[PDB]
């Protein structure tokens, strides 16, 4: 039965007086009784038209979510300070909503559909408006040479995937297949990267708890291709991640306390999720 | 026959209990060996079978009025346990399902309940508001002794000699998820009136078909008192809890020199 098929209809049930007890159970078994309301209440026969289509896993992650806000500028020609190109280590861990949605489950595969929305604004009293700017985006996979200056050889994009966006155009989109080295992503990693041996020194053997990989998805880089305009134009790029063809493999309870860092630590003081209400008061 | 009486036997060991609930197979898949369509490494796997698959017994634990709950990490708890521990420390890659069996017998006059939860990827929080993810391997792998939950959070104030320990709060399940939703995981509840034992058969769940056991813990077992122990005598009642584990369908692929981690 596909997800848009209807739920099972409730059969009519009359009054009953017999040893066939469905209402009693044992939670200690770890099961829960698969009751239907007809089996412990007197019920009418009704055809049920509702469907669980909109509770599909593919539908749950359709709403794409923001993951970063990278800041870029093209400074005035007379200034001595360098042009700010931005570099972002790709990760979902820094925005709480998508993190909570993904951390409902332990392991998952999904193709990532990235969409970039760009905005720009001036920063000084002058009105010497700059022409329509063009922005380069670059996928820098792990171990590739990250750029140092805005006009380095690294921006020649000989092998790196890259996208050029002209301002005022519709937002740029690109689809990324499942790029994880494992058979599925691991949102939690209950282990270490290196284990300290007795032969090793104290400094050599240490590693972070939960750091499955220090560069997992790769690195994203952005610059303004245009030369120094006489007036300072600054810009911000918003990246939106939209999972596609997603599968998940182990549920977990969602988090209550307010998140702190990449790991699963919690900050002092803020360990109070619930609030008061008297037991006797409706 | 009756559902209340159960017998398990793996290898040269056997457990028999007369007050058992029906056993739970976590996520409805029994443990099984690697299928040829899913095996990544090419070297011949070792299959110890009877040589490793028997019920070992971890340390005994005392449950009291003031106690707080306890936790263990697998296969790390079995590192000292015989030939399974030696095979784990000698090889690089390995995998294994487990049958966890918890025994806590008490008379009809006692009351209380334990929640036996099996948590995949059971991460836990650190003992510092600063220095996230800084917990060391020595503290992060207690071995057979296990570790204790705490009723409150108290970060380490002295950065000149940091402890790098865990500090898992009990009602947050040590990771920031409210305890009432812990039942999403596979579970069985001890009620001292109902059943004196509970058992979970846990398959090998991991993103990789086979994984480094020394680096990575697949499952973690949490024993939390959902209702406190109580007895007629006011003079601090205490009863023991015992956790026993049997690896099932274990495999170890790649052989290397002995690992000697700096636990000392």
């Amino acid at each position: 039965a596909t997800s848009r098929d209807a739920l099972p209809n409730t059969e009519a049930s009359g009054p009953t007086h017999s040893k066939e007890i469905p209402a009693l159970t044992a939670v200690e078994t770890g099961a829960t009784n698969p009751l239907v309301p007809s089996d412990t209440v007197q019920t009418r026969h009704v055809v049920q038209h509702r469907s669980r289509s909109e509770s599909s896993i593919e539908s749950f992650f359709a709403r794409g979510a923001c993951v970063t806000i990278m800041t870029v500028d093209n400074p005035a020609s007379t200034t001595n300070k360098d042009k700010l190109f931005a570099v972002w280590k790709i990760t979902y861990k820094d925005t709480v909503q998508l993190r909570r949605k993904l951390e409902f489950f332990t392991y998952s595969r999904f193709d990532m559909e990235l969409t970039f929305v760009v905005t720009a604004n001036f920063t000084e009293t002058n009105n010497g408006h700059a022409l329509n700017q063009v922005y380069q985006i670059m996928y820098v996979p792990p171990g590739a040479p990250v750029p140092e200056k805005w006009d380095d050889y690294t921006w020649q994009t000989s092998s790196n995937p890259s996208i050029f966006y002209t301002y005022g155009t519709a937002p740029a989109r690109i689809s990324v297949p499942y790029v994880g080295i494992s058979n599925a992503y691991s949102h939690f990693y209950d282990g270490f990267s290196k284990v300290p041996l007795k032969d090793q020194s104290a400094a050599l053997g240490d590693s972070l708890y939960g750091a499955a990989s220090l560069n997992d998805f790769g690195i994203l880089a952005v610059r303004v291709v245009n030369d120094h305009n006489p007036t300072k134009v600054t810009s911000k790029i918003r990246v939106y991640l939209k999972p596609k063809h997603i599968r998940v493999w182990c549920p977990r309870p969602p988090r209550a306390v307010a998140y702190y860092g990449p790991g699963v630590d919690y900050k002092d003081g803020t360990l109070t999720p619930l609030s008061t209400k008297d037991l006797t008061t409706y | 026959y009756s559902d209340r009486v159960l017998q398990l036997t793996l290898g040269n060991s056997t457990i028999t209990t007369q007050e058992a609930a029906n056993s739970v197979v976590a996520y409805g898949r029994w443990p099984e060996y690697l299928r040829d369509s899913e095996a990544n490494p090419v070297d011949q796997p070792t299959e110890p079978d009877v040589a490793a698959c028997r019920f070992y017994t971890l340390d005994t634990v005392s449950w009291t009025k003031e106690s707080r709950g306890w936790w263990w990490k697998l296969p790390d708890a079995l590192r000292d346990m015989g030939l399974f521990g030696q095979n784990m420390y000698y090889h690089y890659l390995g995998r294994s399902g487990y049958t966890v069996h918890v025994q806590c017998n008490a008379s009809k006059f006692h009351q209380g309940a334990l929640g036996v939860f099996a948590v995949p990827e059971m991460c836990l929080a650190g003992d510092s508001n600063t220095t996230t993810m800084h917990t060391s391997y020595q503290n992060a792998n207690p071995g057979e002794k296990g570790g204790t939950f705490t009723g409150t959070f108290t970060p380490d104030n002295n950065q000149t000699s940091p402890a790098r320990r865990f500090c898992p709060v009990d009602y947050l399940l040590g990771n920031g998820t409210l305890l009432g939703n812990a039942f999403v995981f596979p579970h069985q509840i001890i009620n001292l009136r109902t059943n004196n034992c509970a058992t979970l058969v846990l398959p090998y769940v991991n993103s990789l078909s086979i994984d480094s056991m020394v680096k990575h813990n697949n499952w973690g077992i949490a024993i939390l008192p959902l209702a406190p122990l109580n007895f007629a005598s006011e003079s601090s009642p205490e009863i023991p809890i015992t956790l026993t584990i049997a690896p099932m369908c274990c495999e170890f692929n790649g052989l290397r020199n002995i690992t000697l981690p700096r636990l000392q």
Epitope: V67, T68, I69, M70, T71, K81, D82, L84, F85, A86, V87, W88, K89, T91, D94, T95, P147, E148, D206, S207, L208, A211, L214, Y260, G261 | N129, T130, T131, T132, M133, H134
Partner: antibody, heavy 126, light 109 residues
């Protein structure tokens, strides 16, 4: 350009440090304090963000050091509420305004210290 | 606490030398906000390398650096007599605290 106040010498009692900067850098960028004991090397003290008044202190001096700001004159004040013989050092006010290329926590831009004040010596002894 | 550095390093003019700054886990390892500063006697510090291998304007190209593991090093190729002075390591230490190194006195022989 950044300006700083005088040098003090009294033992035990509290001492107030003063640092003044241009309005744009004051309002836009954070201000950092660093001490330089004789020949011992630099040591971070804290961070002031006058744009939002969020303040973070080094854990070594978490109690004694206190900081506050003033928008009218584009001036920040640091006060060491109590002093010891170890505090006999040269102190530097500094502004962080050269951005890093790496995006910090996916939402903010890191800034390294790039403009340093002249600094002020302080002595703690009879 | 502070980042480790050698106490002093020396070499004749024209030589190529390396100053090593080894931090703990987190620190130079996890983050890339590692920078180097220079300070002559009687002067305030001056930035010489701000990202891992990136150089600010007005600093000569003979300064260079790189990262590996929990260690990052400053390499001065073609040492000149004017480079004599103190050199300090600096990095970001986990959640919202900052740390300097012990410093190194570089003297030209």
């Amino acid at each position: 350009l950044v300006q700083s106040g005088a040098e003090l010498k009294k033992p035990g009692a509290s001492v107030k440090f003063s640092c003044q900067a241009s309005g744009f850098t004051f309002t836009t960028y954070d201000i950092h304090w660093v001490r330089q004991a004789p020949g011992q090397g630099l040591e971070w003290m804290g961070m002031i963000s006058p744009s939002r008044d969020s303040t973070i202190y080094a854990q070594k001096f978490q109690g004694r050091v206190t900081m506050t700001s003033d928008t009218s004159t584009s001036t920040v004040y640091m006060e060491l509420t109590s002093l010891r013989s170890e505090d006999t050092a040269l102190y530097y006010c500094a502004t962080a305004s050269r951005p890093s290329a790496w995006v910090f926590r996916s939402l903010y831009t890191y800034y390294y210290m790039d403009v340093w004040g002249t600094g002020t010596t302080v002595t703690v002894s009879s | 606490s502070a980042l480790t550095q050698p106490a002093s390093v020396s070499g004749s003019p024209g030589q190529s030398i390396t100053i090593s700054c080894t931090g703990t886990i987190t620190d130079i390892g996890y983050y890339n906000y590692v920078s180097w500063y220079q300070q002559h006697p009687g002067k305030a510090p001056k930035l010489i390398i701000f990202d891992v291998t990136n150089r600010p304007s007005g600093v000569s190209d003979r300064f260079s650096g790189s990262k590996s593991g929990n260690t990052a090093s400053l390499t001065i190729s073609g040492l000149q007599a004017e480079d004599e002075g103190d050199y300090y390591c600096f990095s970001h230490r986990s959640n919202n605290i900052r740390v300097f190194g012990g410093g190194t006195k570089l003297t030209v022989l």
